[PDB]
Design a protein around this ligand. Structure first.
Ligand SMILES: Cc1ccc(Cl)c(Nc2ccccc2C(=O)O)c1Cl
Ligand SMILES: O=C(O)CNC(=O)C(=O)O
Ligand SMILES: [Mn+2]
Length: 434
């Protein structure tokens, strides 16, 4: 098991014959106007301390990313990898701080450019496949976010070795980019500060399943861009090989956000609250229907807003409040919507305890809502635990994994306990009463 770089004669023909959906556009191809603007944006962003290592989960384990990052993109958009939902600090799409919003404006135009370069290469790539479709192409380049990366190999000197082709130290281990639109492209701007050369940053590629076809290590210099086209991200894996100097990168993606925008999730909540009499906002929640399919939907949306949104957000300690206040209000509103749903749940629970309610209808209600209440107990445990791992305590005071929402047994404001174990036990019991 070995690797190839431009030092090798076979490199170029291997690139052409076994990795042709990968494109390099060296630093020369990018206007010098742009290079300075985005390199300042990286630096300003870093200075204001907008880049955090993410507390991520993989194969059951809580791990911090070697790399520090921030997600920038369309307002209300999220990008989710390794069970962690990153929320965009927004960029001036038509429709917070002066210095910070300058960097975001910058990466938006980077986005515009990379998108342009991408559509072109996709057009060329299709043209080489002759020896409507233009909507497919344009959508697969419609980058809606970029995830920025930073590492200092010296200040962060805790790097794994590459296991298969001897490529050396990895800033990022072998992976596929998750949560991307099918066959959508990825475009990376690489900003270094200064066998394969250990001091230089590379991106590495291999075929999935394969450690016999030699991998490519491609040198990345200050300002070089690369592009993963079409199904490349699915058929191959990539990693980042660290150099010795620090480096930034901006990875532009077409996030599959069909259940991952603010608007999507507000609409979901609003769909749940249609089962609620909504003349007035108080604690006396009254439901229009107890048809199983509707109660189930309500409880599923309840879970969705709680775990994919509130807890994901608060798990990162409102670290983005340093960059924008953008999510602050929407997250308050989702909490407020969530609390009403606790009201809904409580009311369903009330109706299940009602005398003059035929067991048949009661058991139909139980069977509809049981899986959701179960999933809700287990995930509440998981998030509680994940919030209090010693790896999470070690973190600073502005990134402290807050377990929100959380309330004590004596809390008069909440109609239901955080711990649903007794509630769940009982409902399960009644369903087995024969
Ligand atoms: C699959 C994937 C996706 C994104 C990152 Cl940053 C990584 N890198 C890590 C993430 C968490 C913990 C360790 C690593 C690593 O690179 O060793 C990986 Cl392995
Ligand atoms: O930084 C790079 O060049 C490659 N980035 C990634 O693979 C990533 O952030 O998912
Ligand atoms: Mn990647």
């Amino acid at each position: 098991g070995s690797h190839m770089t431009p030092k090798d004669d076979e490199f170029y023909q291997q690139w052409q014959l076994k990795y042709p959906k990968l494109i390099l556009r060296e630093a020369s191809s990018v206007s010098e106007e742009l290079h300075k603007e985005v390199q300042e944006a990286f630096l300003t962003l870093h200075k204001h301390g907008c880049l955090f290592r993410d507390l991520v989960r993989i194969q059951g384990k809580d791990l911090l990313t070697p790399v520090s990052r921030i997600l920038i993109g369309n307002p209300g958009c999220t990008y989710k990898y390794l069970n962690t939902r990153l929320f965009t600090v927004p960029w001036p799409v038509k429709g917070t701080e002066a210095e910070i919003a300058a960097a975001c404006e910058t990466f938006l135009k980077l986005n515009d450019y990379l998108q342009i370069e991408t559509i072109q290469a996709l057009e060329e790539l299709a043209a080489k496949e002759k020896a409507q479709d233009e909507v497919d192409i344009k959508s697969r380049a419609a980058y809606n976010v970029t995830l920025l990366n930073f590492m200092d190999p010296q200040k962060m000197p805790y790097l794994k070795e590459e296991p298969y082709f001897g490529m050396g130290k990895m800033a990022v281990s072998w992976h596929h980019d998750e949560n991307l639109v099918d066959r959508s492209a990825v475009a990376v701007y690489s900003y270094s500060c200064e066998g394969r050369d250990p001091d230089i940053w590379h991106v590495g590629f291999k075929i999935s399943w394969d450690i016999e076809t030699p991998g490519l290590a491609i040198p990345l210099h200050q300002g070089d861009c690369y592009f993963m086209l079409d199904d490349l991200n699915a058929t191959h894996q990539h990693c980042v090989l660290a150099g010795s100097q620090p480096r930034f990168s901006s990875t532009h993606r077409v996030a599959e956000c069909s259940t991952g925008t603010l608007d999507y999730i507000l609409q979901r909540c609003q769909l749940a609250l249609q089962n609620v009499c909504d003349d007035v906002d108080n604690d006396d929640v009254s439901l229009k229907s107890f048809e199983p399919a509707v109660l189930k939907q309500g409880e599923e949306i309840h879970n969705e807003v709680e775990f994919e949104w509130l807890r994901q957000f608060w798990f990162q300690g409102n670290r983005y409040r340093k960059c924008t206040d953008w999510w602050c209000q929407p997250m308050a509103q989702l909490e407020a919507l969530w609390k009403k749903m606790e009201g809904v749940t409580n009311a369903v629970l009330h109706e299940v305890k009602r005398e003059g309610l035929p067991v048949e209808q009661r058991n139909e209600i139980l069977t509809a809502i049981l899986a959701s209440l179960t999933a809700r107990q287990n995930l509440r445990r998981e998030w509680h635990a994940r919030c209090q791992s010693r790896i999470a305590r070690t973190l600073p005071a502005d990134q402290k994994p807050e377990c929100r929402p959380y309330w004590e047994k004596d809390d008069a404001s909440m109609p239901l306990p955080f711990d649903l174990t007794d509630i769940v036990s009982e409902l399960r019991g009644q369903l087995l009463e024969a």
